[PDB]
Amino acid sequence: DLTPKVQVYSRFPASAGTKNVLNCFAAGFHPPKISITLMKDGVPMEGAQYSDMSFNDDWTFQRLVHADFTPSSGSTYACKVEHETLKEPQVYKWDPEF
Amino acid sequence: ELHTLRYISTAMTDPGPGQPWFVDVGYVDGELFTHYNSTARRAVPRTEWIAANTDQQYWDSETQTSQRSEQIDRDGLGILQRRYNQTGGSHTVQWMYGCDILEDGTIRGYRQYAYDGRDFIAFDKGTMTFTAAVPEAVPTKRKWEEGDYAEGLKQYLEETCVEWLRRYVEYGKAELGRRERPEVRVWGKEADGILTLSCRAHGFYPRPIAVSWLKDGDAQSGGIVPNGDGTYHTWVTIDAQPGDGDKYQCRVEHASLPQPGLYSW
Amino acid sequence: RRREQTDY
The missing domain is CATH 3.30.500.10 (MHC class I-like antigen recognition-like)
Known part of the structure; x- marks a missing residue:
């Protein structure tokens, strides 16, 4: 299985109104072409940065996407991943854990 | 070395x-x-x-x-x-x-x-x-x-x-x-009659770390993943019975920590 | 420093 394994997480344990960075990490996938977009309420977040294409000892590819954000209560944050191995674009929700 | x-x-x-x-x-x-x-x-x-x-x-x-x-x-x-x-x-x-x-x-x-x-x-x-x-x-x-x-x-x-x-x-x-100390958060969610306990270590350096769940003294780990800034992140969850939340402790072993940390839900 | 490869 060469599908992206995806994890969404913030740089710092989150709190409402506190500056943070939202991270989406996809790994274990092949081929390298992939779309990874950070979302806020179904809408692309601004200011995303993308790691340059890299790969693991087992040859599978990985990429980190991150963007500064200040988490709002009542907003939903997520990462949308599109890859050849997937039958749909896949949305991974961030759990704010507050 | x-x-x-x-x-x-x-x-x-x-x-x-x-x-x-x-x-x-x-x-x-x-x-x-x-x-x-x-x-x-x-x-x-x-x-x-x-x-x-x-x-x-x-x-x-x-x-x-x-x-x-x-x-x-x-x-x-x-x-x-x-x-x-x-x-x-x-x-x-x-x-x-x-x-x-x-x-x-x-x-x-x-x-x-x-x-x-x-x-x-x-x-x-x-x-x-x-x-x-x-x-x-x-x-x-x-x-x-x-x-x-x-x-x-x-x-x-x-x-x-x-x-x-x-x-x-x-x-x-x-x-x-250098050493950077992880900020640890423990988080719990109950779904389908199962309590899922999450232990997350935020922003540690260097990369080697050990995060585990102890019960009274089958874990899933996302591995060690990067932050944008040269530090690292890991999450480790475990499935428990509801109400047993008090029985579990998250243990964090890291070079920046003179003694391992122990965290409750 | 990097090391180039040679023709396949």
Whole structure:
């Protein structure tokens, strides 16, 4: 299985109104072409940065996407991943854990 | 005491719209410190400590090596597609090489290749042999076994690579030797009559860490994943019976922590 | 420092 394994997480344990960075990490996938977009309420977040294409000892590819954000209560944050191995674009929700 | 220098390169027929088809990066002790791609066509620094301790001629030379490597992989993608009787589609060449200084003073060096994500050819410097994983790699092995290539590669892996790794860890000693303490959060969720306890370590450095769930003194780990800033993240969950939340403690072992931390839900 | 590869 060469599908992206995806994890969404913030740089710092989150709190409402506190500056943070939202991270989406996809790994274990092949081929390298992939779309990874950070979302806020179904809408692309601004200011995303993308790691340059890299790969693991087992040859599978990985990429980190991150963007500064200040988490709002009542907003939903997520990462949308599109890859050849997937039958749909896949949305991974961030759990704010507050 | 263990140090590593690792370079990787990717050559793609299908990198995606507006994406560079050739990308290489270098890592010292797992920290990304240089990068090149076929769009900018420059090898560039990626840490403060490499930029401060190198000069224009260093980056011109690294840029020359990457540009030459780019051209050989441009040729190689076509050579291999023809060897494989392929006429289009998504194909990738990858390679990685470098050296390790082990805690005992011994040295490891390696260089290996993959085509379409599976082993293609690999070099054993101690015996000066190549292992061809597939028949399409045998004509390559035949070339690489002749000429100056293999002796020069062995010398690079055992001498040049190690010498540079020693320079880099000296340049970066402050940043590479630092410790950053993880901020730990424990979080719980109940679904389908099962309590899922999550323990997350935010922003630790160096990379090695151990996070585990203890019950009264079957865990799933996302592994160690990177933050944007040179620190790391890990999450570890465990499935418990509802109401048993008080029985579990998250234990965090890290170099920055004189004693392991123990966290409740 | 990087090391170039040779023709396939």
